Design an enzyme around this catalytic site. Sequence first.
Site, PDB file in Angstrom:
ATOM      1  N   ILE A  87       0.777  -1.239   0.000  1.00 36.52           N
ATOM      2  CA  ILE A  87       0.000   0.000   0.000  1.00 36.52           C
ATOM      3  C   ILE A  87       0.825   1.315   0.000  1.00 36.52           C
ATOM      4  O   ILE A  87       0.566   2.170  -0.856  1.00 36.52           O
ATOM      5  CB  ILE A  87      -0.985   0.010   1.189  1.00 36.52           C
ATOM      6  CG1 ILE A  87      -1.984  -1.147   1.049  1.00 36.52           C
ATOM      7  CG2 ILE A  87      -1.732   1.336   1.270  1.00 36.52           C
ATOM      8  CD1 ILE A  87      -3.120  -1.108   2.046  1.00 36.52           C
ATOM      9  N   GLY A  88       1.818   1.504   0.882  1.00 38.55           N
ATOM     10  CA  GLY A  88       2.303   0.546   1.862  1.00 38.55           C
ATOM     11  C   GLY A  88       3.564   1.062   2.521  1.00 38.55           C
ATOM     12  O   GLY A  88       4.385   0.287   3.008  1.00 38.55           O
ATOM     13  N   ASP A 130       5.260  -1.020   6.921  1.00 38.01           N
ATOM     14  CA  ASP A 130       4.977  -2.164   6.059  1.00 38.01           C
ATOM     15  C   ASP A 130       3.527  -2.650   6.138  1.00 38.01           C
ATOM     16  O   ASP A 130       3.226  -3.623   6.831  1.00 38.01           O
ATOM     17  CB  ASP A 130       5.913  -3.319   6.402  1.00 38.01           C
ATOM     18  CG  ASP A 130       6.882  -3.623   5.287  1.00 38.01           C
ATOM     19  OD1 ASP A 130       7.365  -2.664   4.650  1.00 38.01           O
ATOM     20  OD2 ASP A 130       7.144  -4.817   5.031  1.00 38.01           O
ATOM     21  N   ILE A 131       2.641  -1.991   5.396  1.00 34.29           N
ATOM     22  CA  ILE A 131       1.220  -2.336   5.385  1.00 34.29           C
ATOM     23  C   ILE A 131       0.763  -2.873   4.016  1.00 34.29           C
ATOM     24  O   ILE A 131       1.088  -2.303   2.979  1.00 34.29           O
ATOM     25  CB  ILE A 131       0.361  -1.113   5.796  1.00 34.29           C
ATOM     26  CG1 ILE A 131      -1.114  -1.369   5.502  1.00 34.29           C
ATOM     27  CG2 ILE A 131       0.833   0.147   5.096  1.00 34.29           C
ATOM     28  CD1 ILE A 131      -2.050  -0.539   6.343  1.00 34.29           C
ATOM     29  N   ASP A 187       0.255  12.558  18.834  1.00 32.12           N
ATOM     30  CA  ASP A 187       0.748  12.784  17.479  1.00 32.12           C
ATOM     31  C   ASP A 187      -0.399  13.219  16.576  1.00 32.12           C
ATOM     32  O   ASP A 187      -0.627  12.644  15.509  1.00 32.12           O
ATOM     33  CB  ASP A 187       1.432  11.529  16.929  1.00 32.12           C
ATOM     34  CG  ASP A 187       2.294  11.815  15.714  1.00 32.12           C
ATOM     35  OD1 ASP A 187       2.650  12.989  15.502  1.00 32.12           O
ATOM     36  OD2 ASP A 187       2.616  10.862  14.973  1.00 32.12           O
TER      37      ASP A 187
END
Length: 358
Positions: free
Chosen positions: A14-15, A16-17, A122
């Site tokens: 996508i993207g 560590d996704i 955040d």
Amino acid sequence: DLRVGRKFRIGRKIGDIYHGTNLISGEEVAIRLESIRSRHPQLDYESRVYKYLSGGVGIPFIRWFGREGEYNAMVIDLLGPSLEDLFNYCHRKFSFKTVIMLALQMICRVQYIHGRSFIHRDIKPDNFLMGVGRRGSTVHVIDFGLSKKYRDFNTHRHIPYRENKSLTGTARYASVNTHLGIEQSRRDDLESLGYMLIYFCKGSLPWQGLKATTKKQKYDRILEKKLCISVETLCAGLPLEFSEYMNYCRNLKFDERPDYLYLARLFKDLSIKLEYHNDHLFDWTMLRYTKAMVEVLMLDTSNDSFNKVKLLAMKKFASHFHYCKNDDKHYPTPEEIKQQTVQNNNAAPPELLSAIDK
């Protein structure tokens, strides 16, 4: 193979996704991976907080998390673009109506997170994502890697007051107290959210683009601006509600419970005065729709195409598109702002104008 938590399958990055898919129901999900040999692991904690906040409106639903192969994995709701993404899509400036609608949701989310004894720490446009498809009207909160308890779960006893704390995390939206090394608390989340709003409205913050020789120096350069600029200068061209929000957040005490309802009434009362309906019709929604109806390309030529598509949108939807004027020194009244509706319908290529009407 590429299976996670029994029933899920990793797809493209996508993207560590990664893109993930439930093999039983075919539902699209998101999957984050983390090497188990990381020097500093974040994923398990983030997953456990996600679980602790599960059930809250706008809080992504974690479907699975655990150790798989030589990775930590997290399966969660698949989401849309970030507010930063959509900010860019709208060429880095949001209408008042869009900022109001966003501020209202984001105040609700933060209120929920605080209710679960956590501070985000955040707050920034990158960490709010709209949903996918039909859920694209709902603001979600992500990245709880820097999140933290602000009180005991059982006794609601606030964490004690500390100093000499390094800045966490992103300096552009950091509160003034964060710059001074104070322990963060609920006020600081709200303060960053305020900076988000001004950022959205005016197109930037005055302490952007600063360079330094070191990291602390840049932080202190930014601080000096945050601290030495008046809230009047900072919220110039903005209705008084934005100055009120900021004054409110800056006067909150360390362990004080924020009046979230009051902050929400600021923008809600403002929307009513500016005759905005909470119809979840954002800027990008209308711009995207207008470009869709246009694609008169040969005349669109005679960023320039966007400016014209933006003009056709501001004509179609005159009442929705009011913007802050940076040349303004004062706070506008609702009536001053709404005059832009008349000038929006006064936006003059007749074929373009006719295609609009059609």
